[PDB]
Amino acid sequence: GRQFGHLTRVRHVITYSLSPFEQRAFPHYFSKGIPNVLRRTRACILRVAPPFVAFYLVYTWGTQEFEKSKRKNPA
């Protein structure tokens, strides 16, 4: 295990904190929240979306072929 007081070394760093009864738990939830969600999705969409679009195209083609491959031809 590991304990507080034996983790690492830190110097010259100040932390200011406020009590949770002095502040609001939902401050600017929609005012600042939505623009941050847009930035987060914008920053990662190009890395996540393409492979799942690639899956979507294979999925529709493969079923479209199979769904009609067992249709009959005049010959």
């Binding site: 830190v10 110097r11 760093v13 100040i14 932390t15 200011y16 904190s17 009590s19």
Partner: protein
């Protein structure tokens, strides 16, 4: 405070402190406003101490 009669101290006050500003001060009094107390925390981390 010490070995001294209050008469003497008042005589000296009326002598050497009469030149002070009167009771009125031209409407500019310091009125201490209440001071908000805030539950909060400040940590200055310094492991070299």
């Amino acid at each position: 405070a010490g070995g001294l009669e209050h008469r003497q101290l008042l005589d000296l006050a009326q002598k050497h402190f009469s030149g002070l500003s009167g009771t009125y001060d031209e409407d500019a009094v310091p009125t201490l406003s209440p001071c908000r107390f805030t539950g909060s925390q400040i940590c200055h981390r310094e492991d070299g101490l």
